[PDB]
Ligand binder design. Structure first.
Ligand SMILES: Cc1cc2nc3c(=O)[nH]c(=O)nc-3n(C[C@H](O)[C@H](O)[C@H](O)COP(=O)(O)OP(=O)(O)OC[C@H]3O[C@@H](n4cnc5c(N)ncnc54)[C@H](O)[C@@H]3O)c2cc1C
Ligand SMILES: Cc1cc2nc3c(=O)[nH]c(=O)nc-3n(C[C@H](O)[C@H](O)[C@H](O)COP(=O)(O)O)c2cc1C
Ligand SMILES: Cc1cc2nc3c(=O)[nH]c(=O)nc-3n(C[C@H](O)[C@H](O)[C@H](O)COP(=O)(O)O)c2cc1C
Ligand code: FES
Ligand SMILES: [Ca+2]
Lengths: 446, 252, 408, 198, 206, 412
């Protein structure tokens, strides 16, 4: 058992009710091309083409053999491209239920399958993109293995869903996915969770680890840092509970399981709750008549690390399990910086808000101030639980000293690991993009 | 790049440079001694009230303005009279005569003293018209003369004649004097009762009265020897009972 | 007086003792013995060298030759060699060309490695087939107002085992040449007369080496064709001395003798199926002709191909017959030419402007997937930069843009 | 006991070779951008100084001092050239060691590795030893302390410059000008020992 | 011809202190007085010129192992003979030189130019290079000395141009101009001005 | 309204306007009066409420009790000394010859021996306010000049530097000297390095060091700490060095200086340093809010106590400074002011929790050492802080290298 003591449980309004209900009927899905790290697509379809479920849409130039397949059966209606012809989404309009089928195995045959057969089935089905490698958070090359696969059976993000409610419906699929992963790994499988009970695999090399504390107690970066530190020559893989259920369903039935149970929540949602949806569902149709009037921002994922869902990007991400909606803070206040903040949240104690314990805030998308230099009053140390030097690592990230940042521990990090650091910066910096730039430089350098 | 070539070129260059350096160093030694004698005589005479402005007039100004005389420096008696050009440090090289590890060791940090000290009473015609006496101590090599006014010892101005060289031309804080442009006139730090004292005051008073040494700003460091090299003026070791013999009689 | 003797003798003794100590320390702090540069772990090819100098000099004197674009100046970065055993650190003059990923494998610039101890290398590509030849000039007829076609007769009727896109370094002795020796025809002279370029001259006092690309493809046995442009001083400063080596090459006539170095090169085609697009301009027609002729006449590949060439005017076009024949005979190959500055007597009716503008506004703008093709480039640096920028704006990735220029 | 600790502390802090006497400034300002190389330069300077000072002490006391060899024979004018010859031989052996064992430190020094000979700190230490008339043990302690103080100053400057990776210096001031200003600020920082009579 | 070009280049284009780093210690030390700055400038110029000449005369015979010994023997002999002759005859200025004979030997410009130019050039061009480096060094020395002496004592070359409150004027001297931090700041700002008027000397972003 | 005004004259300061060079000043004024009204664009779509404006406004508000007590104390000390020296007609002639005194008497106050707290604070204000105004204007000139030339935007930090510099000078400092000091501190120590958040030295203590070493007679001695005409008097740190605890006596009133007097602030000195009580009340608020570092403050206290107790244990026969205890070291000089408001500068301190302890311990040790064993300076807080500003990055280096070794051992 590991207890995290440095962190922040963000008190934003509109937490969902942990009861599952069916969602709005969805007529369009898409695969967003900019959310895959180090990916350059080779198109296999074009507008007007009719596809089937698990039919390949495009491949990767930089990762030979990786296939990105269609969540549902329908017709390709849009291929969205932006500046310098960068792929933004391949939108499919649902029609029919044709699909591509695979092999099905019994429940007890999964733990002893061949690793190459497992890899072949995953790559062909397109479920191989559920994995991500630390460092660099990329899809694993189809000719590589790892000694550790980390399963994320917990969720500490603001307004996140409870994995227990979802897993308890699909215990057999979860356990089958765990068996498949145990046969797939060369070392062990780490199931990182809370203190509640989950369905358990009987394989000796599948081990459940319990983490306590506030956010980020539920991040794969924290789990790797505490159980299997990653470096250039030690690489770990990550996957979450919904994708493990999908793996189990695929190997038990021979069909791609594209269902999702996401959380619809936010300060401007009338009835926050959990809704059943489909992979890459259209968010403008998912949130149709679910929110209060006004100008709002719909976010695919958390507010700490999510993707703004507007225009061609208004679809559910591959690695996102919630939708966050909140208002737009474009108001201007007279001497607003000097007011006593009874309704203002801060990790410091310069406002009256912290004296009301349990208070819940109707947060918006405001930047409470302007961009400035770094004056280190010691806020990053309150939110970084890892064994690193936050201020110094952030200053190398800002200055662009990639060689020094690698020594200081950048290879262990993802954009979601610096979300609270971006949160509590008085200089209004944004460290996820700086970390991504440094990691891109390290990758390209060799 | 071979041993023979290396050794030959090294030896040749060493000989060629060393012979020139030795010639230019020791072959001028007598001339350097004459230069030192001139810059001692003229330097002391210019404040002695006689305008001995170099070899253009030294031939008619030296030995026609002063006469040699030397004393014990501890009993107030003459023992011989060769002190026309005499330095006490040159005669103190014989061990540590009369000992210098006594209470005044602060000024006597050199721990070396001849049994005879230099004196200069400007007694060309055997009359004591003016008096000058040297100080000589460690702490930035403080070794100086003083003339002061008629009240205790002499007359007019001294400016603390420097013997040969000041440590720096102005690099750092060190005021033994403002070079030769001293603010001195009728200075007074001695006592007629064997009890003088001196500290860091300056500030307007020294232009006539007393206490004209600062020596630095912010350290009091490389002038501490200068400001402490007059605490030795309690007599006995310093020209004996001379400073109660000032303007008294006899030697006067 | 005796003080002088004492000073001299004591100084000399002290200095001699110091120098003797220095020599004693050096005796045990330098190896002073010879070393062996083993190559691919072979008992032969092992080179015994005096422990000093740069690795390139020892390699050249030992009979193993590598790229010398800068000629040992270390500003080229083309002499990369794989070092396995101890060879020291990687000098900062190398970090500008070798990245860390291949710096781990041992790739180093031979211009900077000084041989101090024994070490092991790994020569790549089996370059041991490089050999010097004393060639014979066959013809030197002009092809453009500033470009000439040169044919080389290899001695003893040999044939270079070269790949399309390879290059050779020509070397010349000391000489002094006048531009009056040139034999440009009158219909090309209509510009040389008005610029009075015959008065120019160049001289050579010590031998030099310059690398040139070859315009022939492997089924052209026994000969080596080159396209050479005269290195005239820039028009803004006519007084500047002209290009020595280009002046030398422009002066030779049939029956003369010249010496080449050997077959090198890295600008080779890719072994995929995808579409092929070739972009050449001015004097860059040599590697393009090599590549297209190798692809079509020898390989008989069915890949889709396209060649876009940009000449200054109708006066500067050449190999038109060969490319027209290839385009007519092959349905896969299609040819286009764009004149930057057409003139009234040219009476041109085709595309004008820059070749990259023509290519974009005719072919790549309406293309289904411009990022799936392979682009090969050779020409002026301004055209290279403009075409690279245009291709980058279309989402084309770097590993699909193959570029060979005139010296990196 | 107390005498030698007083001497060591004085040399390191009260009379600092770099930020109190201001000697060694050329290489102090040039080679102080990385702590990794500044540490090696400091160690090399420590070795050179602590070996050169006592050797010159012996040479002065046994050869060049007046009346040290023969009565009346004074050789006190060979002082500078003898001292610089000893320092140059030591630096020659040091270069021989460095070119073989530490190529990364041979580089990033380049033209300054021979100029360790004309580092003003070494010659100033030897001249101060002659002036103060230390003994052999005091010479060893004084040389070691002076080298340690110079290393401390150069490593402090290297750390400051490494921290300045986040600064935004005007283009005409980056490098030498800002290094001069930084050293002038460090001198003001070190001015707090000025009045100590240790 | 090339003579004026070569003597005037190191003044502003290849300045020993402003573009190289050589002579900084003496530049900090002797710039509280214009007379001392002038004397030091002349001494360094003369010594560097003669040392370059004498080193270049025998550049083909110096072994690599004893090169520093040979160079410093020549330089030290030159400086010592200069000091001896100055003491013998020019006693007046030799007294205000005094403790400064030592820094001339260990001045970085002398041996740096001997290493970089004298060992691969001709005698007369080496002499010209020494004179040019002396001029470049003196430019910085006298520019700093002007400001330091003026603002610290109201005097130039000893002649009083700003009357002092101590003697009955209107000016209060700045006591930081008599300390080395002021020399540091002045040299930094002069480097700023030089690299602003000649932007080709700006160092690359690192 | 002001809002419609600020949105009406906005075009003049965009490119193409009649005032396109004063855009920095317009933006500064606009964002002072109203919040920017911007939104997040990349990630962490919600942000914290804190910013540099609040960070510096709290620190500026934290020194108000100290500033007001300093004004009152300066006035009262000057009045007491003047009535000690002069009386009757000579007092009238002295008052008529000084504009501070006759303006205090003209604004309704009194300068006699029975003056009140209002008159004392008015007299102290006549000394404090001109210095603060000069400092702010002269420093703002350089800040705005650098921002306009280099196309940055003016930022807070000078808001704190100005008041901290104006609160640590003697009440009798010349205004031209104040202008020179603020110029040096702003330009040399901070602006050439990039501005706020990009220097390594303390700007407020860098101009004070310039004044200290350039014009010593106006910032040291006996004639500068009480603003009375012709009054000479030593202060408590300069009296202990001479005679110990028996030498602490207020000459103007004939009363001994007690520990309660030193703690409350009834002593001469720099304007804002005197009241340890007020400084502690001010510093507690910003330590609670999370702006100042309790690690740094605790380190300073630890070092001070350790060295000041070692000196007491060793003892001396000639130095009366060897027997001053820690509770006396605390309530004299600028120790409390420095430890609470200058040692806690985030940019000049260490960036590591382990390094902050060493930073504070070094500051305290150096302050006590300069106080005791250095006879030139009676106080050493400014020099101690400027000395630790050079070695903070070395503590950071040591901590980081230990962390990197731990990381390489695969346990961190
Ligand atoms: C793989 C490869 C292939 C190549 N293929 C070809 C090819 O097919 N055709 C071809 O022509 N070249 C080719 N080159 C370039 C070739 O190597 C030579 O650079 C070129 O032939 C001219 O060289 P040169 O020595 O005659 O002239 P250089 O003297 O090297 O060039 C100097 C040019 O600048 C002018 N100039 C001289 N001095 C100055 C000065 N001080 N300031 C300003 N201007 C000055 C000269 O008048 C002349 O125009 C190739 C290079 C490589 C590496
Ligand atoms: C930077 C500086 C600070 C000084 N501080 C004091 C002081 O605090 N108290 C005092 O009485 N004199 C002070 N002085 C003036 C002293 O007289 C100073 O120590 C003296 O000038 C030392 O140099 P001099 O005695 O060799 C200071 C002088 C300077 C330059
Ligand atoms: C932050 C701060 C730092 C100070 N630093 C010094 C210093 O370094 N040296 C000094 O003489 N006085 C310094 N002072 C001033 C003294 O602390 C004190 O105010 C003044 O000397 C009064 O006399 P003191 O001897 O009792 C400082 C004051 C403050 C507020
Ligand atoms: S002159 Fe260069 S180190 Fe002193
Ligand atoms: Ca004495």
């Amino acid at each position: 058992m590991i207890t995290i003591k440095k962190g922040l449980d963000l008190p934003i309004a509109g937490t969902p009710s942990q009861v599952i209900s069916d969602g709005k009927a969805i007529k369009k899905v898409a695969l967003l091309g900019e959310e895959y790290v180090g990916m350059r697509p080779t198109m296999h379809v074009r507008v007007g083409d009719e596809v089937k479920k698990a039919q390949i849409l495009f491949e990767d130039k930089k990762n030979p053999g990786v296939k990105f397949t269609s969540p549902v059966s329908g017709k390709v209606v849009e291929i969205n491209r932006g500046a310098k012809r960068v792929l933004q989404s391949v939108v499919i309009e649902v029609a029919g239920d044709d699909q591509v089928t695979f092999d099905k195995f019994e429940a007890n045959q999964l733990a002893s399958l061949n690793r190459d057969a497992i890899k072949t089935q995953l790559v062909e089905s397109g479920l191989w993109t559920a994995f991500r490698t630390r460092p660099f958070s990329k899809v694993p090359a189809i000719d590589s293995t790892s000694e550790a696969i980390f399963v994320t059976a917990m969720d500490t993000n603001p307004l996140a869903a409870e994995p227990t409610v979802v897993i308890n419906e699909q215990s057999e699929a979860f356990v089958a996915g765990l068996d498949v992963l145990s046969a797939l790994t060369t070392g062990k499988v780490y199931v990182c969770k809370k203190g509640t009970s989950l369905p358990r695999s009987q394989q000796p090399n599948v081990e459940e680890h319990v983490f306590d504390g506030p956010h980020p107690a539920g991040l794969a970066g924290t789990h790797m840092h505490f159980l299997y530190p990653v470096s250039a020559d030690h690489v770990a893989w990550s996957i979450n509970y919904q994708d493990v259920i999908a793996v189990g369903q695929l190997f038990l039935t021979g069909e791609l399981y594209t269902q999702r149970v996401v959380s619809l929540a936010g300060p401007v949602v009338n009835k926050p709750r959990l809704v059943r949806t489909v992979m890459g569902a259209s968010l403008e149709q998912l949130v149709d008549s679910e929110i209060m009037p006004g100008e709002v921002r719909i976010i695919s994922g958390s507010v700490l690390s999510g993707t703004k869902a507007t225009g061609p990007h208004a679809y559910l991400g591959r690695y996102h399990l919630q939708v966050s909606v909140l208002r737009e803070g474009r108001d201007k206040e007279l001497f607003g910086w000097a007011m006593p903040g009874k309704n203002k949240f801060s990790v410091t104690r310069s406002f009256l808000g912290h004296l009301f314990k349990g208070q819940v805030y109707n947060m918006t998308t405001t930047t409470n101030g302007s961009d400035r230099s770094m004056v280190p009053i010691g806020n990053y140390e309150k939110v970084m639980p890892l064994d690193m030097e936050p201020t110094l690592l952030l200053r190398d990230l800002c200055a662009g000293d990639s060689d020094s940042a690698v020594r200081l521990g950048a290879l262990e990090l993802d954009e979601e690991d610096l979300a609270l650091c971006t949160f509590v910066c008085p200089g209004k910096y944004e460290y996820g993009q700086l970390l991504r730039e440094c990691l891109d430089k390290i990758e390209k350098e060799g | 790049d071979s041993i023979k070539k290396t050794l030959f070129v090294v030896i040749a260059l060493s000989l060629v440079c060393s012979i020139i350096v030795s010639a230019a160093a020791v072959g001028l030694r007598d001339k350097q001694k004459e230069n030192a004698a001139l810059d001692k005589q003229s330097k002391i005479l210019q404040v002695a009230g006689i305008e001995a402005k170099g070899s253009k007039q030294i031939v008619e100004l030296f030995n026609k303005s002063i006469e040699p005389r030397l004393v014990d420096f501890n009993t107030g008696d003459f023992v011989e009279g060769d002190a026309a050009n005499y330095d006490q440090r040159k005669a103190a090289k014989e061990a540590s005569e009369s000992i210098k590890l006594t209470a005044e060791q602060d000024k006597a940090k050199i721990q070396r003293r001849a049994n005879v000290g230099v004196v200069y009473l400007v007694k060309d015609g055997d009359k004591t018209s003016k008096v000058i006496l040297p100080v000589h101590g460690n702490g930035l090599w403080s070794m100086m003369y003083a003339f002061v006014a008629v009240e205790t010892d002499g007359n007019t101005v001294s400016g603390l004649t420097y013997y040969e060289q000041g440590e720096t031309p102005g690099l750092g804080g060190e005021v033994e004097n403002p070079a030769w442009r001293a603010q001195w006139v009728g200075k007074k730090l001695f006592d007629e009762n064997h009890k003088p004292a001196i500290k860091i005051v300056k500030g307007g008073a020294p232009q006539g009265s007393e206490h004209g040494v600062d020596g630095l700003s912010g350290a009091t460091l490389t002038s501490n020897g200068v400001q402490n090299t007059f605490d030795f003026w309690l007599g006995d070791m310093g020209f004996g009972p001379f400073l109660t013999k000032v303007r008294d009689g006899g030697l006067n | 007086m005796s003080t002088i003797i004492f000073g001299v003798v004591m100084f000399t003794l002290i200095i001699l003792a110091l120098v003797l100590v220095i020599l004693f320390a050096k005796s045990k702090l330098v190896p002073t013995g010879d070393i062996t540069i083993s190559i691919n772990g072979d008992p032969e090819k092992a080179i015994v060298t005096q422990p000093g100098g740069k690795l390139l000099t020892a390699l050249a004197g030992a009979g193993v030759f590598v790229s010398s674009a800068c000629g040992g100046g270390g500003s080229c970065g083309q002499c990369r060699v794989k070092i396995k055993s101890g060879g020291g650190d990687i000098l900062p003059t190398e970090l500008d060309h070798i990245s860390k990923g291949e710096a781990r494998e041992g790739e180093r610039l031979a211009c900077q490695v000084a041989v101090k101890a024994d070490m092991d290398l790994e020569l790549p590509e089996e370059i041991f087939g490089v050999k010097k030849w004393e060639c014979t000039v066959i013809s030197n007829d002009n092809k453009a107002t500033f470009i000439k076609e040169l044919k080389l007769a290899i001695p003893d009727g040999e044939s270079v085992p070269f790949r399309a896109g390879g290059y050779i370094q020509i070397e010349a002795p000391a000489h002094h040449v006048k531009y009056a020796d040139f034999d440009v025809p009158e219909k090309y002279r209509g510009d040389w007369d008005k610029f009075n370029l015959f008065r120019y001259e160049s001289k050579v006092d010590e031998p030099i080496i310059r690398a040139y690309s070859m315009a022939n493809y492997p089924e052209e046995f026994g000969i080596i064709m080159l396209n050479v442009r005269i290195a005239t001083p820039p028009p803004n400063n006519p007084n500047v001395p002209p290009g020595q080596m280009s002046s030398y090459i422009w002066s030779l006539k049939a029956g003369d003798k010249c010496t080449i170095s050997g077959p090198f090169g890295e600008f080779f085609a890719k072994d995929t199926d995808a579409e092929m697009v070739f972009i050449g301009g001015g004097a860059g027609m040599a590697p393009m002709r090599s590549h297209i002729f190798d692809q079509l006449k020898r390989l008989k590949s069915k890949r889709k191909m396209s060649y876009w060439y940009g000449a200054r005017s109708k006066r500067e076009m050449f190999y038109v017959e060969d490319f027209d024949g290839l385009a007519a005979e092959n349905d896969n190959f299609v040819w286009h030419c764009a004149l930057s500055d057409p003139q009234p007597e040219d009476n041109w009716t085709g595309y004008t402007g820059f070749i990259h503008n023509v290519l974009y506004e005719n072919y790549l703008k309406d293309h289904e997937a411009p990022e799936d093709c392979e682009y090969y480039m050779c020409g002026p640096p301004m055209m290279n930069a403009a075409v690279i920028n245009m291709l980058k704006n279309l989402g084309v990735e770097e590993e699909n843009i193959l570029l060979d220029d005139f010296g990196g | 006991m107390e005498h030698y600790i007083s001497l060591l502390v004085k040399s390191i802090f009260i009379e600092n070779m770099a930020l109190s006497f201001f000697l060694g400034m050329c290489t102090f300002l040039a080679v102080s951008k990385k702590v990794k190389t500044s540490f090696g330069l400091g160690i090399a300077v420590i070795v050179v100084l602590t070996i050169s000072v006592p050797v010159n002490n012996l040479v002065y006391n046994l050869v060049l001092k007046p009346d040290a060899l023969v009565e009346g024979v004074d050789l006190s004018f060979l002082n500078f050239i003898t001292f610089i010859g000893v320092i140059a031989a030591l630096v020659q052996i040091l270069e021989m060691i460095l070119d073989r064992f530490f190529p990364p430190l041979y580089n990033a020094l380049g033209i300054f590795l021979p100029l360790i000979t004309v580092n003003c700190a070494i010659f100033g230490g030897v001249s101060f030893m002659v002036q103060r008339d230390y003994s052999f043990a005091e010479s060893v302690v004084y040389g070691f302390g002076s080298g340690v103080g110079w290393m401390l100053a150069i490593v402090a400057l290297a750390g400051i410059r490494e921290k300045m990776k986040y600064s935004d210096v005007p283009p005409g001031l980056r490098g030498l000008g800002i290094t001069f200003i930084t050293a002038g600020l460090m001198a003001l920082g070190f001015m707090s020992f000025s009045g100590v009579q240790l | 011809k090339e003579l004026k070009k070569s003597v005037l280049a190191p003044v502003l284009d290849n300045n020993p202190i402003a573009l190289q780093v050589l002579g900084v210690c003496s530049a900090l030390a002797v710039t509280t007085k214009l007379e001392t700055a002038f004397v030091m400038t002349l001494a360094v110029m003369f010594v560097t010129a003669l040392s370059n000449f004498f080193v270049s005369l025998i550049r083909n015979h110096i072994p690599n192992s004893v090169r520093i010994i040979v160079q410093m023997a020549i330089i030290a002999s030159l400086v010592i003979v200069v000091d001896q002759i100055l003491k013998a005859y020019l006693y007046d200025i030799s007294k205000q030189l005094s403790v400064f004979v030592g820094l001339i030997i260990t001045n970085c410009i002398v041996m740096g130019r001997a290493e970089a130019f004298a060992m691969k050039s001709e005698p007369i061009p080496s002499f010209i290079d020494g004179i040019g480096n002396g001029l470049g060094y003196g430019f910085v020395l006298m520019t700093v000395g002007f400001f330091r002496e003026l603002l610290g004592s109201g005097k130039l070359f000893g002649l009083e141009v700003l009357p002092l409150i101590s003697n009955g004027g209107w000016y209060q001297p700045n006591g930081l101009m008599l300390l080395a931090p002021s020399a540091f700041f002045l040299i930094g700002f002069m480097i700023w001005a030089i690299r602003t008027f000649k932007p080709e000397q700006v160092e690359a972003k690192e | 309204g002001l809002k419609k005004f600020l949105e009406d004259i906005e075009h003049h300061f965009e490119p193409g306007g009649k005032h396109e060079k004063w855009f920095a000043l317009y933006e500064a004024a606009a964002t002072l009066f109203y919040t920017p009204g911007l939104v997040t664009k990349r990630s962490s779509h919600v942000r914290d409420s804190v910013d540099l404006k609040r960070i510096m406004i709290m620190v500026w508000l934290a020194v108000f009790p100290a500033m007001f007590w300093g004004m009152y104390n300066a006035g009262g000390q000057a009045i007491a000394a003047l009535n000690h020296l002069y009386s009757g007609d000579q007092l009238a002639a002295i008052v008529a010859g000084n504009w501070h005194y006759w303006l205090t008497e003209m604004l309704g106050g009194t300068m006699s021996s029975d003056a009140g707290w209002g008159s004392k604070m008015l007299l102290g204000a006549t000394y404090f306010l001109p210095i603060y105004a000069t400092v702010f204007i002269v420093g703002a000139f350089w800040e705005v000049l650098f921002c306009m030339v280099r196309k940055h935007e003016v930022n807070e930090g000078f808001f704190v530097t100005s008041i901290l510099f104006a609160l640590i000078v003697p009440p009798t400092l010349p205004l031209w000297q104040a202008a020179l000091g603020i110029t040096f501190g702003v330009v040399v120590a901070k602006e050439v390095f990039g501005g706020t958040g990009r220097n390594f030295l303390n700007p407020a203590l860098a101009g004070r060091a310039f004044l200290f070493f350039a014009y010593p007679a106006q910032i040291s001695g006996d004639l500068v700490w009480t603003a009375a005409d012709g009054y000479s008097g030593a202060t408590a740190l300069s009296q202990w060095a001479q005679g110990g605890a028996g030498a602490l006596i207020n000459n103007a009133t004939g009363q001994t200086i007690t520990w309660m007097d030193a703690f409350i602030g009834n002593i001469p000195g720099s304007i804002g340093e005197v009241s340890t009580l007020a400084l502690m009340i001010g510093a507690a608020f910003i330590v609670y809010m999370g702006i100042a570092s309790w690690r740094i403050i605790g380190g300073v206290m630890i070092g001070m106590i350790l060295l000041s107790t070692l000196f007491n244990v060793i003892g001396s026969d000639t130095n009366a400074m060897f027997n001053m205890p820690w509770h006396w070291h605390l309530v004299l000089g600028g120790f409390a002011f420095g430890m609470f408001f200058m040692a806690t500068d985030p940019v000049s301190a260490s960036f590591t929790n382990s390094g902050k302890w060493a930073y504070g311990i070094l500051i305290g040790v150096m302050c006590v050492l300069i106080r005791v064993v250095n006879p030139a300076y009676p106080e050493g807080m400014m020099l101690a802080i400027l000395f630790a500003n050079l070695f903070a990055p070395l503590f950071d280096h040591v901590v980081v290298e230990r962390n990197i070794k731990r990381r390489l051992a695969r346990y961190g």
